[PDB]
Amino acid sequence: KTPTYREPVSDYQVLREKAASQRRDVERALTRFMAKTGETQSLFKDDVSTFPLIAARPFTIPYLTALLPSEL
Amino acid sequence: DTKPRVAEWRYGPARLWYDMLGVPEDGSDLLADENFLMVTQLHWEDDIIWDGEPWYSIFPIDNEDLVYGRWEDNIIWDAQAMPRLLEPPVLTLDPNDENLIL
Amino acid sequence: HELSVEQQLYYKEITEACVGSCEAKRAEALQSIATDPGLYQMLPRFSTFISEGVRVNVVQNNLALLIYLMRMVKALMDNPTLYLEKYVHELIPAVMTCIVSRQLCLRPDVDNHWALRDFAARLVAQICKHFSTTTNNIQSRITKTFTKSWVDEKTPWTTRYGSIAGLAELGHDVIKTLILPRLQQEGERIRSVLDGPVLSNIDRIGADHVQSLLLKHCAPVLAKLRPPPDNQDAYRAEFGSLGPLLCSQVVKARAQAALQ
Amino acid sequence: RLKPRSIHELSVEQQLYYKEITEACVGSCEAKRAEALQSIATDPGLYQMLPRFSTFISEGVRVNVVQNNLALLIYLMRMVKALMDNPTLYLEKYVHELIPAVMTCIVSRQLCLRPDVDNHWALRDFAARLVAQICKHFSTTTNNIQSRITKTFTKSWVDEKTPWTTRYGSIAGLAELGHDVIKTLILPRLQQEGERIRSVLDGPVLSNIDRIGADHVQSLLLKHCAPVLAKLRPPPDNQDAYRAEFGSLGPLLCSQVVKARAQAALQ
């Protein structure tokens, strides 16, 4: 009656790969969701499914969104 | 006993529900066993295939809460007459699950 | 342990898209949840959000937000990449709360709590088809809760409707060995339908909804375990109506055979 | 907050035991199999490992009929038989996985060479029909298990233009169901059996498995009909009265009945 555990994956290569691919997938999902539910642009003629761009909106005060840090 | 709800976080997952509620800060014979055996409740005939065409665990480890816990005690049978008082649960990030970095 | 800003923003946008500002952003958010590859590390947050939001129905009996949370669960189930085995113990009682609770409505008479009933019943039949293992005992423990909620008297017609709906979405052998012994209960139902001292109460609409669901689901069960003639099966049945429904079901089966 | 790292409900001695028993039960060596089968047949602590054994059986037969690997199947059926006669463990929680595995051994087509191992194939259907009627003997409640497999066997039989492997297996399965079952079911169907035999005989096609299937089915049906007759009538007019039943077994059936009578006299 000696207990056993699950196989732990302590490998730096596969941990870097997992964190990288999860970050890339969540940022791709976020940008496709935000480009689909708003005004969109396109590099190609009538191209919304592949490479959708969030449309450029003008700010009333652009230095506040440019120069200010968001994580501090 | 009447359940008016209670919230202890307003800052973790479900903060949107807590804010909508406005809870500030931390302030708050057919029951015979055989009937339920899956031989008598499953169309296992569909499975029959006709003319088809260990130092670390070998097997996976199941959710202890699903396998053992009485989750049935979180079913709200009557909203007004709720037998016990439910309390807000904090996120517990289980590390047994793979696909979670930590 | 704490979500990065990317996925924190994704969690915020996806959860606030399913609260009800417009329908198109909701459909794109549910099509995001159903069809993205990397949504793990945000599954516990979604499970907590859904279970707490279904709990918040007791303070505000909002039918619409419960329909939105059940469509969130139905979208979470259709994702091929994420495995809900470690988090199903949270989503099972939320869908169960959407099934067997009694006040699902703010105005009980006009709100169709009835659909959030059969939608969540189909959802729990799917959640115990995909995940029931003999170590889990999910389906047996769900049938036991539905059964002791149905056989026990004093239960309201809404929660009896939810119990019958879930039991009848589980399959054919379940309605053979759970529903069909208590068909005499239909007489106890028709006690309060064909002859009620109080007609203007809210028990009559729930009772004949229970009746319609019962005879709709027991018509193919009567078509499976009876003779092909069915001359006075309705008379032999309770109230003589279930038997008419069974005759209609046999006719429908004949029509399906003709189409084949 | 992180929930504690859970442990599997089997010990590592138990998990190693499961690995050794399963790698012995795939029959690389026969003495290893036989002990592992006796170990399954009398280990008292083999409960709480039984989900993993049932899942290994079920999953195995389904990916082992993708290519019809007869030994893999004969070893798994012997593992099922060794699981059943163990008195300690509680089996009818797992019989919903066990029964469609055995039905598949009996009612399925053989992807590997059709002849030669058909002799074993009959035994694969012999071992499967044995464990099938042992499962209908145990685990019995009202109108769930025995009647369900009886209905599937009968609609396997009355189905027109069957695979003859499936036909032979279903015939064996309905045959081993006891005294009354052949007394009430095999009776109104002799003419169909004879017509099927006549079609295999007429069509020249010999390189298919239809002729072998037909001979096995006819022999099995004739033996069952022999005692079904020895059991409910006197042995008078055993020469040409069976010609009222299309003359299939006739005097040879009468000789089988006489051998049964001699065995009864010896008893």
Side-chain angles (χ1 to χ4, degrees), chain C residues 1-220 223 227-229 234 237 240 243-244 253 255 257-258:
Chain C
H1 316 85
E2 290 124 301
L3 278 186
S4 171
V5 47
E6 299 69 357
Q7 42 202 19
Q8 218 161 350
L9 181 58
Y10 182 70
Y11 179 72
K12 183 193 88 72
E13 295 291 322
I14 284 298
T15 50
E16 298 169 353
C18 298
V19 301
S21 77
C22 68
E23 168 65 34
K25 287 179 66 179
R26 143 172 302 128
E28 300 297 325
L30 294 181
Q31 280 159 337
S32 179
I33 293 178
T35 57
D36 291 311
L39 303 195
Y40 341 94
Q41 172 62 224
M42 300 182 50
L43 202 40
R45 281 96 199 183
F46 277 134
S47 86
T48 332
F49 173 79
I50 283 159
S51 62
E52 283 307 277
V54 176
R55 265 195 199 165
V56 159
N57 168 65
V58 71
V59 254
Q60 302 93 357
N61 299 23
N62 199 327
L63 174 136
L65 296 199
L66 289 191
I67 291 189
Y68 303 148
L69 288 158
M70 285 304 113
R71 303 203 316 115
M72 211 164 171
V73 175
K74 192 249 185 180
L76 261 182
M77 268 186 230
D78 306 338
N79 211 336
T81 54
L82 53 84
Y83 321 109
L84 302 151
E85 288 141 324
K86 299 291 169 178
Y87 315 100
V88 73
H89 65 266
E90 269 175 296
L91 313 167
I92 283 173
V95 183
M96 216 63 63
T97 308
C98 280
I99 291 171
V100 297
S101 178
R102 58 173 216 78
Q103 267 193 350
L104 268 287
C105 310
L106 189 61
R107 323 174 73 281
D109 225 69
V110 98
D111 285 352
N112 204 220
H113 44 334
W114 304 128
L116 181 50
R117 298 300 177 82
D118 51 57
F119 181 59
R122 218 168 315 126
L123 211 48
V124 77
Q126 189 183 350
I127 212 173
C128 83
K129 180 197 85 166
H130 282 315
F131 295 111
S132 178
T133 308
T134 323
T135 80
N136 269 322
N137 278 301
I138 285 187
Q139 180 158 335
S140 177
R141 289 208 288 169
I142 282 178
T143 15
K144 202 178 176 187
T145 61
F146 280 164
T147 292
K148 77 159 75 177
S149 187
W150 187 41
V151 179
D152 175 47
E153 254 88 21
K154 311 151 58 198
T155 43
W157 289 110
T158 56
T159 82
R160 294 186 95 117
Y161 183 80
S163 298
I164 294 169
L167 284 182
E169 265 299 326
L170 287 193
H172 158 55
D173 298 82
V174 162
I175 74 178
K176 267 191 67 164
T177 188
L178 276 311
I179 304 288
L180 263 292
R182 300 202 63 231
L183 201 71
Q184 51 91 14
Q185 188 259 359
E186 183 180 332
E188 180 265 336
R189 182 209 45 83
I190 212 160
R191 198 274 304 166
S192 161
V193 173
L194 286 175
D195 174 18
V198 185
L199 187 134
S200 294
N201 57 357
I202 76 178
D203 312 343
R204 206 163 295 243
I205 183 81
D208 105 296
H209 264 289
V210 159
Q211 175 184 11
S212 76
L213 187 88
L214 265 174
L215 66 100
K216 179 177 87 163
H217 282 128
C218 292

Side-chain angles (χ1 to χ4, degrees), chain D residues 16-51:
Chain D
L16 181 59
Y17 172 80
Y18 165 79
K19 197 191 172 201
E20 295 296 339
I21 287 295
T22 51
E23 287 201 306
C25 278
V26 296
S28 177
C29 181
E30 214 277 333
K32 270 202 153 187
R33 170 136 27 77
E35 162 56 8
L37 258 56
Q38 279 160 125
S39 183
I40 292 172
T42 187
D43 207 317
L46 203 140
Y47 95 102
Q48 192 261 335
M49 211 186 315
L50 195 43

